[PDB]
From a paper:
Here, we characterized Atu1419 as a transcriptional repressor of its own repression in addition to two other genes (atu1418 and atu1420). The structures revealed Atu1419 to be a member of the VanR group of the FadR C-terminal domain (FCD; Pfam PF07729) subfamily of the large GntR superfamily of transcriptional factors (>93 135 members in Pfam database). Like FadR, Atu1419 possesses a characteristic molecular architecture, composed of a conserved N-terminal DNA binding domain containing the wHTH motif and a C-terminal effector binding/oligomerization domain. We identified the short palindromic region composed of 10 base pairs and a degenerated palindrome bound to Atu1419 and the N5,N10-methylenetetrahydrofolate (MEF) as the effector molecule disrupting Atu1419-DNA interaction, allowing the expression of the second part of the HCA degradation pathway.
The orientation B of the citrate was also observed in another structure of Atu1419 solved at a higher resolution of 1.75 Å but in a different space group (P21212). Here, two similar monomers (RMSD of 0.98 Å for all Cα atoms) are in the asymmetric unit and form a dimer, which in turn form a tetramer by the crystal symmetry with globally unchanged dimer interfaces (1553 and 701 Å2 per subunit for dimers AB and AD, respectively) compared with those from the P212121 structure. They resemble subunits B/C/D of the P212121 structure and bind similarly a citrate molecule. Nonetheless, their citrates are slightly shifted by 0.6 Å toward Arg86 losing the interaction with Asn221 compared with those in the P212121 structure.
Residue numbers in the entry:
A (entry chain B): 7 to 243
B (entry chain A): 9 to 248
């Protein structure tokens, strides 16, 4: 909607495609010239992408495109899992309003409808979209804006987002099968929160993030053509 | 680090001179600080990245509002992230040189303590505590982990020695540093032993020292709250 927001989209696209490679130094004026836009939205975009974690600030001014390896991707997924586990634990310890529980339980019920009678019968893209909703609701459940922000910050890297490892091209039997266990975890997270069992809520929500890690390991081992389909992984490989 | 504009703007936010909910714009903020536009523009962006300001839709910024429950949540996030750094160092293994670096800090921290329970070099401990926590964030050797721990420690009341300014040198707090120092030793021992679950449990529990001391300030020393630079901006229960 804003010049700044469009600058963020264009700059993110250029970083993800490798047009602005890892290690490239970026400055407000020269980046505005490269994007063919005004200095002001570029200043905002460079700051927002530093908050997002695609860029680092340079000492003395300016920015630098971050470089990422597969070990960085694993660490980013682990941080998301740790923060989602914290949001689940605090919701369990503090208690959640019935309306907020009904909202997330409705998402869980819609997610159950993605599954059929055969093991690989899963509406993959439908699950990926509802999964995004479930994880946003989980981040907000305990009612703390400080917690919600931190969870969303830990989910902001292109490969760290909750459905990053569910791109449409990854709709294969091995990935569909893995969603059954992942959906049982969604149900267990909500049950643990309803039961006020914080240690369980944390353990399951953190373990849930290992589904994306295990699917990344599967891509490397058995389906390397899929690596380029996950946002941010094409340049790494 | 954005020079004097960042320092001046941060100081004004922390003292409550620019209160929570105040809208800030580049040009009018530069006029208020009597500083040129360029460093002020950069400072507003840096302080949004640090988490003290939010960007407004359509341009400009807004000072965030914080209550004591927000401070507790921020300390909890720092503890959770420090626990993650300790767990990953335990699981992955640390080079002997990196362990010797953090162990040297632990030994210097032990030198802060005398034979009487009250005998503690409070300011010396506060300074070396910052080094210990920065070293812990870096121990596993992952730049992703190090950057995230530092980001979770960027709010003024969330930093590892935020509650240890010179003006907070009181009996209950000096006495609390002894148990805190035993936790520093237990974190390192757990990492050396490759016991990740222990490393995480102790490092996360360590952050509850700042939480317990905040609860003590509210209950027994409310005069300290306003004298702790990172707590002056907090809105109390009656006003938040
Ligand atoms: Zn999920
Ligand atoms: Zn400490």
């Amino acid at each position: 909607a804003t010049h700044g927001g469009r600058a963020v989209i264009e700059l993110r696209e250029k970083i993800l495609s490798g047009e602005l490679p890892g290690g490239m130094r970026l400055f407000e004026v020269s980046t505005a010239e490269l994007l063919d836009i005004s200095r002001t939205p570029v200043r905002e975009a460079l700051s927002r992408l530093t908050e997002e974690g695609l860029l680092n600030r340079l000492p003395g001014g300016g920015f630098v495109v971050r470089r990422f390896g597969f070990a960085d991707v694993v660490d980013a997924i682990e941080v998301r899992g740790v923060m989602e586990g914290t949001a689940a634990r605090l919701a369990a310890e503090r208690g959640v309003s019935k309306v907020a529980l009904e909202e997330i339980d409705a998402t869980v019920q819609q997610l159950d409808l993605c599954f059929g009678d055969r093991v690989d019968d899963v509406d993959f893209d439908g699950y990926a979209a509802l999964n995004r909703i479930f994880h946003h609701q989980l981040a907000a459940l305990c009612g703390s804006e400080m917690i919600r922000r931190e969870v969303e910050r830990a989910s902001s890297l292109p490969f760290a987002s909750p459905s990053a490892f569910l791109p449409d091209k990854a709709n294969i039997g091995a990935f569909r099968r893995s969603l059954r266990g992942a959906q049982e975890q969604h149900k267990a997270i909500v049950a643990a929160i309803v039961a006020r069992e914080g240690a369980r809520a944390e353990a399951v929500a953190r373990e849930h993030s290992r589904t994306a890690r295990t699917n990344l390991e599967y891509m490397i081992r058995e389906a390397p053509e899929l690596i380029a389909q996950v946002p941010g992984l094409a340049l790494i490989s």
